[PDB]
């Protein structure tokens, strides 16, 4: 794994095995990294953006590719993780947070440029804490006698969800499935959510000062078909002895969005197996 | 005990011995933990919610299962307890309360992931004090090189009682007992009480930002039958020499709710034995 | 013995008689020395490394081969032993410790190049005390008009145990025994423990500046089968009159690791016979 | 005596004559040494641990067996004694204390391996002063061309008393005597007191790094029956002319623990005879 440059087959295989729907994410991720990781000269690190609705698999997919790259998954000493609240709660110690940030970066990357960093809960940040990293995302071949363009920086959020929602019902109201929705959607309004001078969108506004991001990538509500997928596949994978009635109860005993149609889920495949344990309790 | 994974028989036995009514709680608890504790891969810690009326046995049942798991019950070094007021009175020292919180957590859990935490008196809290724990309730296999998904976090309150009351008289007014009331009841209005921007419900509103809770579980007023149960069973268990007249006085000398029906208790089995000591005084 | 070059049969015989499990150690040791001792031109002394969990037989196996080589075992004037604490407690007298070290070396080896040195308790050392011996582990045919490449230097520790543990439950969690685990395991993480700038791992970091070590060799927790082996074999060897119930009490009256599975021992065959004397006391 | 290997009869006889209660200690000691002293190959010295409450006979029993082994008792040149405070007061001269320790050891043991050492007042020690002796408690057949595995090292303390107390009232509250309490009791919590990073328990924490101890052995409060035993037996042994009223005054004129039950003694048979001299004064 760690001694394997990821071939396309392994990743399309993995996602097609476990990922439900999200054709966009398979296309994007597969071709994007498969070009990137095979490139000995990326010219830049990987600046990925994610937002939308939960339980669609953000930390899921990040975990998966983390496992395919390194056996450590998240256990790898290379793969070192940060969080907003656990590390960076307050606007008091912003400077310490910046210095500690820069140094912990230089440590892990100076171990190897193929190390990976991820952030999470980015609705609770303070733009000084981007002001210490934009130079690291210059396409410069180096900084301080070190190159960073092999590493890969990945973000997470949920803002801008309202656009992917009302668009989802837009085309779906057109007698259509999001398979037929294309990858291109209104990246202008995404730029607004990302220009949105709310601290969530203001953070990424000052980051998008130069589109240091590579690719905006929203996920979508795992439709009740996906519920049934992560009910059948999971409970049959767990020796759970599920049957049909339990999968009548996916929709007989769940709330979807909006009420007036009862379509878009509230969790997808996040709270699915707990409620399925109720359906063991039946 | 501590070297015993709890079999179903032991727990249904215990609850059927000592717990009066609360069929819902026996079903929920028994199957829920019995699936959870036997699961070597829970994918998440146990995020339990409780609210409703007192004296129905919240701290009672938590105590019981604490004893069945570990001989320490609450004496266990693993089982380390926090309280709102005793530890976290003021909105002044919120930050210290968060840091001390995180560290005391990491201590006990780093002793073992099967440690247990409980909170109480959650009507007196401040949402910063959830903002330090939501990452711990990611389904992440780890944080900071440590996994938390085996541990079990349990909360307590009494808000939202009005719904379980007016529903209780709803179906009971229908010529019916809450045995015939099903577990499913209006979890939407429960979400409102849990969305209720009152600090009690606002706390759990920002927690229910992702339904990090597993199962909402209300208790109900221990009906005067339950009084008579925890009068006969207790006083016969205590060598008290109770007789019939003392159990005429359970209702001849007590207030129930509402007045116009005199049905729902005020304490259930909490103040029962003190008033029974009056009936020794007769 | 001392006039015997160790044939393979004698050593595989001895280990297969007395050593329980540790297939890796039989393979490694047997072929390694059997090639080494029979080699009139080793090109280097034997640079052995050991770490892991106790009571698996480090000082046991070193004792055994010491006996097979020379009748003295440890009594041999050739076989002269050093210890961290007994000889080299403080960082004050480091220089005296280095000079005395070099001279005591030159004495014993100048008696014969087939002399043996062992160290122990290597978590309490100071890198100056390797800085006097790395030249002795050049593959040079000589130093100061003397050759050292026939002698054999052996170390001991317990650091890096966490890796052999979590790996042991890794493959064992895979429905598997460590017989099916191969000798190859993650020698990268072993290099980290051996790069671990802790003084224990920093010592061996500056030693592994050139991999002057030959073979990393961890031992593993002597599984409760091995307990029962060194209960039956020992007590039947001691005329102890053991029976079945005493070997019910190996697990009825012992702690294993983790609690949640009760698998990996705490001592293996170290404290076994004392507790068995309790089972005489029964 | 010194030319006598202790037969079982002599020791069970002696303890059954003079020792009051402490069935556990008779079983442990008798079988343990009787197997040990008769063993020509112990494989280790005797690593005994003692803690609990005073006046139950620690220095008493150590004295007794010291007398049975050698006529010198404590007068023997073989039996050479150390104390924390008298010899090892300060953390200033720790090194001198270690060197003097090692040398005085080597002296007495080189006189004979059947020499005995005891320590006392071990709540006032400094872990450097174990760091010089753990090698002596390797099961090695020798060190420095000398074997130590015949000698016997014995410790004393009073920490961890709280566990033997609250357990004593646990089973005693169960309608029961500690005769019916078994030898097995919560050796986990004993390990905590012995892991207790207090210097008293931290000392023995770094010793229990390898369970170099053989057997944990607590004593218990000599119950008022034992008072009356060491009142009748002693005063009748002393020609004191005791009568009944004096043994009404054992409890009419003494404090026990807790107040609310007045059960567990404060001294047992330590201050007993002085207060009995008051009852001569009556
Ligand atoms: N598309 C999917 N197919 C199958 N299972 C999924 C899918 N998406 C999510 N899950 C499951 O749901 C759970 C939640 O996934 P994950 O945490 O990655 O979503 P998320 O967007 O990271 O949530 P949040 O945004 O709150 O961090 C996981 O346990 C995962 O296995
Ligand atoms: N269902 C029941 N059957 C028998 N006894 C009960 C029951 N419920 C409560 N009791 C008794 O009533 C007392 C109160 O129980 P408990 O404190 O668990 O209720 P609670 O909901 O925790 O109260 P609060 O909400 O005020 O903390 C206990 O002493 C318990 O033994
Ligand atoms: N695999 C085994 N089979 C049988 N007996 C064993 C085995 N391993 C250890 N023992 C016994 O356990 C005791 C401890 O062995 P030994 O001291 O060699 O372990 P160790 O790793 O050297 O301990 P430490 O690391 O603390 O020095 C010895 O008396 C030995 O006979
Ligand atoms: N079980 C017993 N039966 C009869 N006499 C006893 C018993 N235990 C103690 N004594 C008497 O009480 C006195 C105190 O005994 P001893 O000093 O051995 O207790 P200790 O635990 O060593 O005290 P400390 O812990 O303070 O050193 C002695 O004089 C002894 O004779």
């Amino acid at each position: 794994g760690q001694k394997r440059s990821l071939s396309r087959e392994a990743l399309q295989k993995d996602l097609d095995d476990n990922l439900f729907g999200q054709h966009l994410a398979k296309k994007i991720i597969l071709n994007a990294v498969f070009g990137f990781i095979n490139n000995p000269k990326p010219k830049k690190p990987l600046t990925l953006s994610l937002h939308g609705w939960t339980g669609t698999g953000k930390n899921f997919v990040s975990k998966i590719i983390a496992e395919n790259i390194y056996e450590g998954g998240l256990n790898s000493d290379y793969v070192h993780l940060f969080v907003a609240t656990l590390h960076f709660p307050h606007a008091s110690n912003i400077t310490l947070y910046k210095d500690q940030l820069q140094l912990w970066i230089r440590g892990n990357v100076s171990a190897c440029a193929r190390s990976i960093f991820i952030f999470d809960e980015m609705d609770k940040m303070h733009a000084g804490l981007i002001d210490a990293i934009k130079p690291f995302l210059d396409y410069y071949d180096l900084v301080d006698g070190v190159s960073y363009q092999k590493a890969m920086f990945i973000f997470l959020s949920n803002a801008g969800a309202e656009r992917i929602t009302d668009v989802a019902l837009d085309f779906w109201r057109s007698g259509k499935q999001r398979e037929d929705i294309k990858l291109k959607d209104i990246e202008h309004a995404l730029s607004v959510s990302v220009f949105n001078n709310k601290n969530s969108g203001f953070w990424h506004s000052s980051l998008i000062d130069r589109n240091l991001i590579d690719y905006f990538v929203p996920f979508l509500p795992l439709e009740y078909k996906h519920l049934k997928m992560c009910i059948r596949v999971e409970m049959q994978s767990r020796g759970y002895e599920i049957d049909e009635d339990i999968v009548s109860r996916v929709a007989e005993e769940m709330t979807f969005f909006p009420k007036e149609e009862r379509v878009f889920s509230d969790k997808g495949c996040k709270t699915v197996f707990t409620k399925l344990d109720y359906y063991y309790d039946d």
Side-chain angles (χ1 to χ4, degrees), chain A:
Chain A
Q2 69 276 16
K3 300 297 190 174
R4 183 178 182 271
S5 66
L6 295 173
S7 67
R8 184 178 181 271
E9 182 63 26
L11 295 173
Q12 66 185 357
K13 180 67 173 67
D14 292 331
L15 296 173
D16 291 331
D17 290 330
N18 59 8
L19 183 62
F20 294 160
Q22 298 297 118
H23 64 281
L24 61 87
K26 294 181 181 179
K27 185 176 179 179
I28 298 161
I29 297 167
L30 183 64
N31 292 319
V33 67
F34 182 75
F36 182 76
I37 192 67
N38 290 317
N39 189 358
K41 298 293 183 182
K43 187 183 286 185
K44 292 187 288 185
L46 184 62
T47 61
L48 183 62
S49 178
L50 294 174
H51 63 86
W53 184 257
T54 188
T56 61
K58 293 180 181 179
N59 291 316
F60 182 73
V61 297
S62 68
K63 183 178 184 293
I64 296 165
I65 191 68
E67 291 179 353
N68 289 318
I69 297 167
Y70 293 165
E71 184 177 0
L74 295 174
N75 290 317
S76 179
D77 58 356
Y78 294 101
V79 177
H80 183 73
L81 277 295
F82 293 160
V83 176
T85 61
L86 295 174
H87 295 89
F88 294 166
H90 294 88
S92 65
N93 291 318
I94 61 170
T95 300
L96 295 173
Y97 294 163
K98 291 186 288 186
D99 292 330
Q100 293 177 356
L101 182 63
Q102 293 178 356
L103 295 173
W104 292 352
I105 294 165
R106 185 179 295 112
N108 289 315
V109 66
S110 63
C112 180
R114 298 292 183 184
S115 179
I116 297 168
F117 292 164
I118 298 168
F119 293 166
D120 191 358
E121 293 180 353
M122 297 300 291
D123 294 331
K124 293 181 180 180
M125 295 298 291
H126 295 89
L129 294 174
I130 60 169
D131 293 330
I133 61 169
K134 292 181 182 180
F136 293 168
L137 296 174
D138 291 331
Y139 65 92
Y140 293 165
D141 288 334
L142 61 85
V143 176
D144 293 331
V146 177
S147 181
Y148 294 167
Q149 64 187 2
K150 292 182 181 179
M152 297 183 283
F153 292 165
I154 297 168
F155 292 165
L156 295 174
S157 178
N158 290 318
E162 293 83 1
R163 298 284 75 77
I164 60 166
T165 57
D166 66 359
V167 174
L169 61 85
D170 186 75
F171 293 100
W172 182 67
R173 179 70 276 172
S174 68
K176 186 181 288 295
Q177 185 61 259
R178 82 290 184 280
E179 294 295 328
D180 292 330
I181 297 169
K182 300 295 186 291
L183 181 62
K184 187 268 183 183
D185 194 75
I186 59 168
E187 73 274 15
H188 296 284
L190 294 175
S191 297
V192 176
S193 296
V194 173
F195 291 166
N196 189 359
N197 290 317
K198 183 177 185 292
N199 191 359
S200 297
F202 182 76
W203 180 262
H204 295 89
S205 73
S206 173
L207 292 173
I208 193 166
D209 185 74
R210 298 294 86 189
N211 286 323
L212 295 173
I213 302 300
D214 291 327
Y215 292 164
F216 291 167
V217 178
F219 292 169
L220 295 174
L222 293 176
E223 189 67 31
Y224 64 90
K225 65 183 181 179
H226 293 169
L227 294 175
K228 294 181 180 179
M229 292 179 185
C230 62
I231 296 166
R232 298 290 185 185
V233 176
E234 291 185 354
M235 297 298 103
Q236 295 293 325
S237 296
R238 296 292 299 275
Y240 181 79
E241 294 179 353
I242 189 166
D243 60 356
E244 182 61 25
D245 292 331
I246 295 169
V247 175
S248 66
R249 300 289 181 90
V250 65
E252 293 176 354
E253 292 295 330
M254 185 63 74
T255 302
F256 293 164
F257 292 165
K259 178 172 76 176
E260 293 82 3
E261 295 172 349
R262 292 178 65 86
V263 178
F264 292 165
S265 66
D266 183 67
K267 298 293 182 290
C269 297
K270 186 176 178 180
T271 62
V272 64
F273 64 92
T274 61
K275 298 294 291 182
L276 293 175
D277 292 330
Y278 181 74
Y279 301 161
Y280 181 77
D281 305 339
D282 193 0

